[PDB]
Structure formats: structure tokens, C-alpha cells
Amino acid sequence: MLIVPYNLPLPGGVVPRMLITILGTVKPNANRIALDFQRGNDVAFHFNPRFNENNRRVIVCNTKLDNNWGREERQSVFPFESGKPFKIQVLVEPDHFKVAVNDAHLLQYNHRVKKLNEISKLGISGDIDLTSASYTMI
Ligand SMILES: COc1cccc(C(=O)N[C@H]2[C@@H](O)[C@@H](CO)O[C@@H](S[C@@H]3O[C@H](CO)[C@H](O)[C@H](NC(=O)c4cccc(OC)c4)[C@H]3OS(=O)(=O)O)[C@@H]2O)c1
């Protein structure tokens, strides 16, 4: 049990083989979830499940540079459900973030921010009860 929004420091940034695990439960009638891997004010990787975007469920991924959002990468597959416990795993690979939800591969997101060792915070926010947030090296 953690306060949301939650800031998880990533000491010395991220690196290939680093696995980030987020456990929580989606609130009833959730509207959004967000993971924000930050390089200072920039958002290297924004992972944003939207539960009701024009009555559709979509996950939006993007990068924010100098306060400007870039080109979104949208995904049809939506493994989250209001009310239900989830696990998000984000594995840093040399050329993308690889995301699995509930042990099923979901998406990958190519590195736009290439100073991986400066991506030194993860913000976790949105309509969840957050159980734990941690990392390990595989
Ligand atoms: C609907 O179908 C498609 C298909 C392909 C592309 C888009 C498009 O780029 N959509 C964009 C575009 O309309 C853009 C124009 O300003 O706005 C975004 S919304 C924006 O998308 C960002 C990612 O690209 C990011 O998710 C923004 N959210 C925030 O920055 C943010 C931060 C903290 C709290 C928070 O609460 C909602 C929001 C979020 O801003 S918010 O006002 O709705 O909260 C939208 O997805 C749409």
C-alpha cells in the first residue's frame, strides 16, 4: 500500500536487463493509469491506459521533450479491467522498453530518449490502488 501518485527513484537511470514491476488494483470505474519514466522534466516513456476515450479502451504511449508531446504509439490490446488486480512488468532492452501485463507480452516502445542512465525516476499515477513498485536486474 503506497500513495498515488508515487515516485520510484531509478538510481543511475535505466539500463538493459533492468526489470520494473508494478503491482496494483484498478479502481472501479477507472478513467486512466499512467507510468512516466522521466529524464528530468522530459518523459522518456509515457504508458497511458485510457478506459474511456470516445467509449473505447486504448493504451497510448509517447515521449515528452521540452514540454512537447511527440507522436503517439497506440495499441489495440487492453488487458486492464476496472476493479481487478494487475501486474505491469517493464523490461528495458537495448533498443526498446518491453511491457508485459499479467505475464502476457503487450507492447514494445523504441527508445527515443537515448541517455538511458539519465532516466532516473518512474512516476506512477492514475486510478489505481498501488500495492508495490520495485526493480531488479535479470
Ligand atoms: C483518438 O484517436 C487518435 C489516433 C492517433 C493519435 C491521436 C492523438 O495524438 N491524440 C492526442 C491529441 O488529440 C493531443 C492533442 O493535444 O492530445 C492528446 S491527450 C494527451 O496525450 C498525452 C500523450 O500523447 C498525454 O497522455 C497527456 N496527458 C498528460 O500530459 C497528463 C499528465 C498528468 C496528468 C494527466 O491527467 C489526465 C494528464 C494527454 O493530455 S490530457 O489533456 O488528455 O490529459 C491526444 O491523445 C488520436
Side-chain angles (χ1 to χ4, degrees):
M1 202 185 216
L2 309 168
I3 297 170
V4 178
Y6 189 79
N7 175 64
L8 179 63
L10 308 171
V14 304
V15 64
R17 302 198 78 71
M18 185 166 187
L19 180 67
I20 298 85
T21 300
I22 304 101
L23 290 167
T25 297
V26 180
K27 289 182 178 279
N29 300 114
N31 187 61
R32 69 185 296 273
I33 302 168
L35 309 174
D36 289 282
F37 288 88
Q38 294 139 155
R39 172 173 175 260
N41 187 63
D42 284 354
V43 182
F45 176 39
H46 177 73
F47 173 89
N48 177 209
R50 300 184 181 180
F51 287 80
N52 180 13
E53 184 189 66
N54 303 133
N55 305 131
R56 302 182 187 194
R57 308 196 301 173
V58 59
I59 301 165
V60 173
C61 296
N62 208 347
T63 293
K64 199 177 66 206
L65 301 175
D66 292 343
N67 251 22
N68 297 312
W69 290 110
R71 172 183 295 359
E72 292 179 353
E73 293 180 38
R74 299 159 156 266
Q75 179 49 226
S76 60
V77 179
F78 195 94
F80 303 96
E81 294 287 345
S82 288
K84 297 205 200 181
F86 64 86
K87 176 173 67 179
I88 304 166
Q89 291 165 311
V90 183
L91 180 58
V92 183
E93 292 196 327
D95 294 325
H96 44 263
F97 296 96
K98 186 177 74 191
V99 181
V101 178
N102 303 340
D103 293 314
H105 177 69
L106 176 64
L107 62 82
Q108 54 174 50
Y109 185 86
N110 193 278
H111 296 306
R112 305 187 190 170
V113 171
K114 315 202 171 261
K115 289 172 175 177
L116 300 183
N117 67 2
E118 294 185 3
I119 305 173
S120 64
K121 289 184 184 262
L122 173 57
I124 311 168
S125 60
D127 299 325
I128 63 171
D129 293 337
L130 179 60
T131 299
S132 59
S134 65
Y135 47 76
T136 191
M137 302 284 310
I138 63 157

